[PDB]
Design a binder for this molecule. Structure first.
Ligand SMILES: NS(=O)(=O)c1cccc(F)c1F
Ligand SMILES: NS(=O)(=O)c1cccc(F)c1F
Ligand SMILES: OC[C@H]1O[C@@H](O)[C@H](O)[C@@H](O)[C@@H]1O
Ligand SMILES: OC[C@H]1O[C@H](O)[C@H](O)[C@@H](O)[C@@H]1O
Ligand SMILES: [Zn+2]
Length: 257
């Protein structure tokens, strides 16, 4: 199956997922000089006060923090979005060293990691139906740089020892994702895809301009996770990022002047 290594990584995915060479693939490089302010963007609304986290899972690619998405609780609205998008899960992409790990890049600069908060459009009823639609998903992307610790990340870091290997999960109730955001909601937006197989072209990307700072110790604990299952030879879970893909017939819009 697909992964990130030399023999099953991003350069191989097109053989089983031909959309990998499609017209609106993600991630992309964000050229900040070419991105244009868009006055038709409405105010962005991140409404996470009633979020209900449930569980954290090592899926063999990354770890997902899962939310109760049976009701609107935690929703993203506004900005480029028509309608209401409900939070289903968040996860990260990160590197083997601080100089790489992000999927999006900013004027070709790679960050140490990138957080993705995944939401689905409630007009389609369920995530599975949403991923059959051009406007089914909205992903809020946040860059991580290494500096001061992020206090709102520490609960995540401290549970990772209990989900070291593929297929392990743990209770993860009462986690507040608001503690993962930066101060500013300035953003760039463009139409794209899932960055993992099946690479479906369903996503409105909203990438925040301001990175969050995390400590070296925090990201080092991400790098102690394993891609492999229990009892199998250790393969550290690092470099679980797809590189930038061709922009093709797209424009990146900015929320700020
Ligand atoms: N196209 S894929 O990355 O999902 C893949 C899956 C299994 C074996 C492979 F060699 C391979 F490339
Ligand atoms: N990396 S990603 O945010 O594009 C992503 C990954 C897995 C499932 C998703 F729905 C998704 F959006
Ligand atoms: O035709 C002019 C239009 O070109 C488009 O490519 C841009 O997105 C618009 O901002 C601009 O007004
Ligand atoms: O909020 C997420 C988790 O944080 C800490 O691990 C708490 O000990 C646990 O009870 C909670 O589920
Ligand atoms: Zn992702």
């Amino acid at each position: 199956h697909w992964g990130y290594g030399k023999h099953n990584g991003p350069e191989h995915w097109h053989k089983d997922f031909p959309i990998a060479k499609g017209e609106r693939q993600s991630p992309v490089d964000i050229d900040t000089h070419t991105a244009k302010y868009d006055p038709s963007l409405k105010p962005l609304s991140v409404s996470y006060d009633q979020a209900t986290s449930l569980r954290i899972l090592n899926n063999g690619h990354a770890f997902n923090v899962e939310f109760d998405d049976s009701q609107d609780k935690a929703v993203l609205k506004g900005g480029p979005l028509d309608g209401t998008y409900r939070l289903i899960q968040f996860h990260f992409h990160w590197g083997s060293l601080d100089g790489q790990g992000s999927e999006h890049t900013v004027d070709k600069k790679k960050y140490a990691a990138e957080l993705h908060l995944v939401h689905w459009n409630t007009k389609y009823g369920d995530f599975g139906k949403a991923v059959q639609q051009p406007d089914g998903l909205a992903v809020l992307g946040i860059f991580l740089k290494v500096g001061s610790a992020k206090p709102g990340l520490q609960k995540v870091v401290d549970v990772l020892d209990s989900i070291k290997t593929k297929g392990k999960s743990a209770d993860f109730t009462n986690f507040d994702p608001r503690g993962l955001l930066p101060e500013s909601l300035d953003y760039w937006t463009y139409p794209g895809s899932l960055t993992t197989p099946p690479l479906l072209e369903c996503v409105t990307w909203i990438v925040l301009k301001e990175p969050i700072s995390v400590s070296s110790e925090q990201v080092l604990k991400f790098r102690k996770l394993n891609f492999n299952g229990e009892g199998e030879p250790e393969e550290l879970m690092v470099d679980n990022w797809r590189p930038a893909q061709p922009l093709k017939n797209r424009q990146i819009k900015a929320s700020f002047k």
